[PDB]
Amino acid sequence: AKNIKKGPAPFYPLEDGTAGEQLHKAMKRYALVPGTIAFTDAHIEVNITYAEYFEMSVRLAEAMKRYGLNTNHRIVVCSENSLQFFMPVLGALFIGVAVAPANDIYNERELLNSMNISQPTVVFVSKKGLQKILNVQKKLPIIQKIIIMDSKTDYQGFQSMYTFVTSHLPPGFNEYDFVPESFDRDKTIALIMNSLPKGVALPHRTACVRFSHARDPIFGNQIIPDTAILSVVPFHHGFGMFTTLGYLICGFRVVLMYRFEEELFLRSLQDYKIQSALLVPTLFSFFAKSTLIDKYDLSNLHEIASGGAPLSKEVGEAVAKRFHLPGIRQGYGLTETTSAILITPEGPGAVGKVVPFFEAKVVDLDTGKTLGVNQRGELCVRGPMIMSGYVNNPEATNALIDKDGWLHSGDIAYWDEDEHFFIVLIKYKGYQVAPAELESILLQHPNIFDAGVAGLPDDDAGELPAAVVVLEHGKTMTEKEIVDYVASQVTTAKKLRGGVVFVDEVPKLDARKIREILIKAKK
């Protein structure tokens, strides 16, 4: 039907080659132009050129190949944003070794979980993540080799990427004669991203599709010379990962920050003549509060982007206003879709439109029937960036992605007559009660760890506000105490009249499930 929204034709058609071959080709070209900046560390002010980057990545690929890694192996890159981050990443993509970026503020257990899924043979780690990695290594025997990222010399008995390279490169190695590995880009996994979190396996193909979006004048950035991006987002997460890979294809200057600071951020936008800035959603709310913005020459700034993270119309508008932009670039994407598949086209709080290569439909929550215009239903997407599946979790894979290839997002959305998508009150006796407001009240009680509010169905009152509560460990609390507590804080219409159902986990809040549990226990 016309109830499947489909992305238009891309400006740059999907190119043949693995993601590693496409990156090598692009990077080798910029490398041949002396002084072309690939990355700039805003904190230390150091620039690293494409020639430096290309040559180091090529040497790492060859050294890892010589060492013995192939498509049967995975590496983990565990580091805060740095000039060094993408070296092992590029190196591994060039030879078809899967890269599993591990969150650098993960404690040792989150780190252990992550790595337990990715089962890396070699781990690249920044100096400050070494202890954690040594402790994870104790437990994961597959980790044979630890390599220090931000060191030139060996560091604490471990080789740096430079000494490792020197250990395995053949004599007379020539970075410009190196030819990347060619392999099936559909079967060969580029990135294993973290979404108990799961490993999302992403074949080279999804990166190659992303490379088309990255330079799309509508769905990405037009490749203009001297384009600079200020990136504050984590490189180990899909937003930072896939925008950066795309920027490297485009020859852009990626200015990185690993620690947010207001002045450094705005001074960087100005001094580096940044055209495009990337922020996590909570930095958007932050900038809605900033009064320093006008002190800076941000004449080059054209875009502030949220990636696959949707923002409220209000926060987005507040931030566009503060930066005197007509809007904000947002979108919707999941770890499981590589990057955003609904993006604000160039030219409300519409999350954007379907990206080239993709199709999106919303289905009835009950029946799964594909719904039409401005009808709310579950957002499902189908396209070449959808993951291959969860690493060693086919069940979870099958529950998310159907037999026709549609990924069931679990999110509710609808599309207007222009194909703009939008991502999306309990009524007690006519009176409106926003569950979020009762949840905030419940969350702020010392005995309550987590709470989800939904309307227990009660035809006489229409809907009774009820809650599922996860208690704080060691803390005991009765339904009465919780209902009383709420009543003491809210107007009569907002009282928790439907009660509490104590759960261990609150199903974004799956309101339908919260509702389900309420009906099972209550009636």
Side-chain angles (χ1 to χ4, degrees), residues 161-186 188:
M161 302 189 297
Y162 294 76
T163 57
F164 170 76
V165 148
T166 292
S167 292
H168 305 274
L169 283 181
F173 179 67
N174 193 117
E175 304 84 4
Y176 294 81
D177 292 350
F178 171 92
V179 173
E181 291 300 288
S182 173
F183 41 74
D184 185 60
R185 54 135 105 140
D186 296 323
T188 313

Side-chain angles (χ1 to χ4, degrees), residues 122-130 132-186 188-195 197-301 303-312 315-362:
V122 178
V123 179
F124 290 87
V125 68
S126 61
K127 296 176 172 179
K128 66 196 289 176
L130 182 60
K132 282 178 291 170
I133 295 304
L134 281 179
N135 295 355
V136 165
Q137 179 186 42
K138 286 170 175 159
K139 307 179 177 52
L140 293 184
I142 189 169
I143 300 170
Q144 300 184 334
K145 176 68 165 160
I146 296 184
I147 297 173
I148 313 296
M149 292 169 71
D150 50 341
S151 191
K152 288 309 172 66
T153 56
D154 283 355
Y155 174 81
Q156 290 187 16
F158 300 86
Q159 292 194 302
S160 63
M161 302 189 297
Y162 294 76
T163 57
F164 170 76
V165 148
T166 292
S167 292
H168 305 274
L169 283 181
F173 179 67
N174 193 117
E175 304 84 4
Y176 294 81
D177 292 350
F178 171 92
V179 173
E181 291 300 288
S182 173
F183 41 74
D184 185 60
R185 54 135 105 140
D186 296 323
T188 313
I189 287 141
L191 283 308
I192 291 163
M193 305 299 281
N194 280 127
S195 168
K198 290 157 192 54
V200 170
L202 306 179
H204 278 249
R205 172 201 66 254
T206 83
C208 304
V209 175
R210 173 58 196 170
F211 295 162
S212 170
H213 297 157
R215 42 199 178 162
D216 199 287
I218 305 300
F219 297 86
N221 301 120
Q222 176 79 88
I223 302 170
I224 285 106
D226 288 301
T227 292
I229 298 90
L230 181 57
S231 179
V232 202
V233 302
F235 286 163
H236 57 74
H237 172 265
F239 188 20
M241 175 59 62
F242 297 100
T243 53
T244 306
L245 291 184
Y247 297 147
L248 296 174
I249 294 284
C250 299
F252 295 163
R253 179 190 193 168
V254 185
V255 184
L256 62 91
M257 279 176 74
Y258 46 78
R259 295 188 294 93
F260 179 76
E261 304 185 4
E262 190 176 17
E263 289 167 292
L264 179 59
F265 183 93
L266 299 161
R267 192 177 56 253
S268 295
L269 287 181
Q270 162 182 280
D271 288 2
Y272 297 117
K273 298 169 177 166
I274 301 299
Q275 278 83 19
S276 176
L278 309 192
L279 300 170
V280 300
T282 53
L283 290 177
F284 274 99
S285 306
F286 172 92
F287 278 113
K289 300 164 185 183
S290 184
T291 61
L292 280 181
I293 291 159
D294 283 10
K295 300 185 168 187
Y296 300 85
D297 181 357
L298 303 181
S299 56
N300 291 277
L301 186 66
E303 162 184 280
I304 303 181
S306 62
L311 311 167
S312 62
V315 177
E317 286 179 1
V319 180
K321 204 178 179 293
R322 289 287 198 188
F323 283 94
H324 312 284
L325 296 179
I328 288 314
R329 198 94 187 252
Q330 49 176 298
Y332 178 94
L334 299 174
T335 310
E336 295 82 357
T337 71
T338 299
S339 41
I341 56 197
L342 303 171
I343 291 179
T344 299
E346 185 81 34
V351 80
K353 284 187 167 178
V354 195
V355 296
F357 298 102
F358 269 75
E359 53 193 334
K361 65 178 176 174
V362 296

Side-chain angles (χ1 to χ4, degrees), residues 49-107 110-123:
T49 61
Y50 276 89
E52 288 164 270
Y53 227 92
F54 172 76
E55 289 165 28
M56 187 51 184
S57 302
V58 161
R59 289 159 63 81
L60 271 164
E62 185 64 37
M64 281 184 284
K65 163 162 181 165
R66 292 293 177 150
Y67 179 80
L69 309 190
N70 50 58
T71 57
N72 284 290
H73 306 92
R74 294 147 306 264
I75 60 160
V76 153
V77 175
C78 184
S79 182
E80 59 274 9
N81 289 358
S82 68
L83 292 169
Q84 291 74 38
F85 197 96
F86 283 84
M87 287 173 184
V89 179
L90 289 171
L93 294 184
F94 290 170
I95 60 167
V97 172
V99 178
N103 193 329
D104 64 303
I105 61 168
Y106 266 177
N107 43 42
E110 293 182 299
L111 202 52
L112 178 58
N113 171 216
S114 175
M115 289 169 77
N116 198 93
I117 292 170
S118 57
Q119 296 291 325
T121 306
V122 178
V123 179

